[PDB]
């Protein structure tokens, strides 16, 4: 769980991501839409082609929400409260799907920061994406 | 495990560049670090107490290479995973008692390791092909539990 | 889906007593109640807003019966699930886009409903046979995603 | 998540379980060992035969810990803190296994309280067993 050591790794790792959070969030969606095509189902209204401006715009929102969560590890439930309602009540996103996106975001971070993506940092980031996924599916069950 | 002949060609071309010991040792070590309950299967390997003990244990690297060499065999026999791994399917179910969910975790950790090692060559499309391969392997090892 | 001829006989004997509409409507309704994201596939059924709207919607009961009748067909063809559900496997992957994990949730909700209806006749051994059947069905519907 | 309505259903449902909690905990283990035999792996030192006294004794401990959790829904992490250490550090129980046991415990409650095991009560009890499973695997990741 998010232990102090995990909070320290996650803050340090996100400082290295720095200004690429939105570009990494866009790349992660892309790998998710190509590797796990059932996910494309929640985005009928998007142009999902490589480089669509919408995906790029949505990659920035996801990237900013992760940057917000990193700033409030002590209280993700209140920082992401509004996103729980949307994903649970409004979008009815199948929980398996947060796992696929988390996997795609770790893959993207491994591509771009190979030297910073150490085993201990990979373990803390997985716990973090798991905590964020739990808050977003909390309003369900 | 239902790929275009060009996707298959891209898959095989990357495997020509895979160092099975470096990638295998890293994939297995990261599994043991990231999903800690997986360490109970490897009691006999000795010190697995912290990331450094884990990434440097020679027993982890050698087992990672064996696991990866076997994976490389399913890559070279994509039209026949089910038969390539049947005997391996019975060892894991019968003797090791590994839950099949762990085959999927390892497949994904493998994908994250290929990304780390190939960087931008490990494109979104190449990653999508590899997700079909790791799922193809995870289901053929899981074929004897079913 | 790898059963003793006596386990198979116990499985079939229970199915002689299954009311497919009562059990099917209840299994599907409980799925929709207990795992709420499953309601997005059934937008066209109308009011699914609370447990009573859900358990009483005639659309839920009729679909539950169809799903259960089809399940009853895999029960009568345990030596051939894969072929019994191939066409159903493509509908769910291709047209419905249902994640395969939901097939496992429904199979388990079905088991909980059989327990509720048969009580102490639904022994631990009979439940173990049924877990092999629901997993056998969940994997044949999931056979075309793989 | 455990909303007040879920806490009210869980307390009411556990009052109906009353004194059979240990006998239901023993039956649930039995259905779990027969339906999902990989689980038998954590109990080499037990006699797992139908009616073993050990399984019956362990069914009582599990039943009592659930009865404790039902008394502390507002704070499961502190009430079950000691059980998190054991399952995560000492036993290294694969998290998939809490799901199988939760399923087996719901099956057992459906057998014995068919009239009380309503769809809304089944939904609250699932959320509860999920919360209890999360606390017990928290000390991992
Ligand atoms: C790390 C996990 C996630 C985070 C932080 C996240 C964050 C967000 C954010 C910040 C928004 C934008 C809301 C707005 O613009 O008001 C959003 C919208 C949305 N997300 Fe999530 N998301 C996550 C995972 C997912 C997953 C796994 C899916 C489905 C596969 C998904 C599907 C959607 C959809 C369909 C929308 C509405 C988009 C639109 O119509 O513009 N999200 N998400
Ligand atoms: C990609 C999926 C996997 C493949 C291809 C694979 C392949 C293999 C192979 C080739 C061996 C050597 C067997 C022998 O020569 O007797 C082996 C053994 C073993 N594997 Fe798997 N494996 C996989 C996943 C796993 C997972 C996820 C675990 C546990 C978390 C696991 C645990 C073990 C153990 C404990 C042994 C025996 C170790 C020993 O001999 O010291 N494997 N596996
Ligand atoms: C036990 C596993 C299942 C079986 C045997 C099964 C079987 C069936 C059958 C026989 C039909 C009728 C198809 C037709 O005649 O065109 C159907 C349709 C459908 N099923 Fe499945 N199903 C299963 C699981 C699921 C799950 C878990 C979901 C979603 C959560 C799902 C969603 C649907 C939908 C949305 C349709 C089309 C509905 C309509 O025609 O209004 N099914 N299924
Ligand atoms: C609802 C979930 C669970 C609860 C509340 C729970 C509770 C407990 C309790 C109260 C103990 C006794 C400790 C003592 O006597 O000091 C225990 C021990 C143990 N449990 Fe868990 N348990 C749960 C799930 C599991 C699962 C899923 C497994 C593995 C499949 C498991 C395996 C064990 C083992 C191996 C022990 C030690 C038993 C012995 O040697 O006597 N438990 N559990």
UniProtKB/Swiss-Prot annotation, chains A, D:
GO-annotated cellular components: haptoglobin-hemoglobin complex; hemoglobin complex
CDD domains recorded: Hb-alpha-like (cd08927)
Tissue spec. comment: Red blood cells.
Domain Globin, residue spans: 1-141
Phosphotyrosine carried by residues: 24
Positions annotated to bind O2: 58
Record PTM N6-acetyllysine, positions in chain: 16
SUPFAM superfamilies, A to Z: Globin-like (SSF46458)
Location of Phosphothreonine modifications: 8, 108, 134, 137
Role, per record: Involved in oxygen transport from the lung to the various peripheral tissues.
Full protein name: Hemoglobin subunit alpha
Protein's organism: Equus caballus
Swiss-Prot record, chains B, C:
Residue pairs linked by disulfide bridges in the UniProt entry: none
Keywords tagged on the record: Acetylation, Heme, Iron, Metal-binding, Oxygen transport, Phosphoprotein, S-nitrosylation, Transport
Phosphoserine modifications at: 44
Pfam families found in the cross-reference section: Globin (PF00042)
N-acetylvaline: modified positions: 1
Modified residues (N6-acetyllysine): 59, 82, 144
Protein family: Belongs to the globin family.
Function: Involved in oxygen transport from the lung to the various peripheral tissues.
Name listed for the protein in its UniProt record: Hemoglobin subunit beta
Species classification: Eukaryota, Metazoa, Chordata, Craniata, Vertebrata
């Amino acid at each position: 769980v998010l232990s102090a050591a995990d909070k320290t790794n996650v803050k340090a790792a996100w400082s290295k991501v720095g200004g690429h959070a939105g570009e990494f969030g866009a790349e992660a969606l892309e790998r998710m839409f190509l590797g796990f095509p059932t996910t494309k189902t929640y985005f009928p209204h998007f142009d999902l082609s490589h480089g669509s401006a919408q995906v790029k715009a949505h990659g920035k929102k996801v990237g900013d929400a992760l940057t917000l969560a990193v700033g409030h590890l002590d209280d993700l439930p209140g920082a992401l409260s509004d996103l729980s309602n949307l994903h649970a009540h409004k979008l009815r996103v199948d929980p398996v799907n947060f796992k696929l996106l988390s996997h795609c975001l770790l893959s993207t971070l491994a591509v771009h920061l190979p030297n910073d993506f150490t085993p201990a940092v990979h373990a803390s980031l997985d716990k973090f994406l798991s905590s964020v996924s739990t808050v977003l599916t909390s309003k369900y069950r | 495990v239902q790929l275009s002949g060009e996707e298959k060609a891209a898959v095989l071309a990357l495997w020509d560049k895979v160092n099975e010991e470096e990638v295998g040792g890293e994939a297995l070590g990261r599994l043991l670090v990231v999903y800690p309950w997986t360490q109970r299967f490897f009691d006999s390997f000795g010190d697995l107490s912290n990331p450094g003990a884990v990434m440097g244990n020679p027993k982890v690297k050698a087992h990672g290479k064996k696991v990866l060499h076997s994976f490389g065999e399913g890559v070279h026999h994509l039209d026949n995973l089910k038969g390539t791994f049947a005997a391996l399917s019975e060892l894991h179910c019968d003797k090791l008692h590994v839950d099949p969910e762990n085959f999927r975790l390892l497949g994904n950790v493998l994908v994250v390791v290929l990304a780390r090692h190939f960087g931008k060559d490990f494109t979104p499309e190449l990653q999508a092909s590899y997700q079909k391969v790791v799922a193809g392997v995870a289901n053929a090892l899981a074929h004897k539990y079913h």
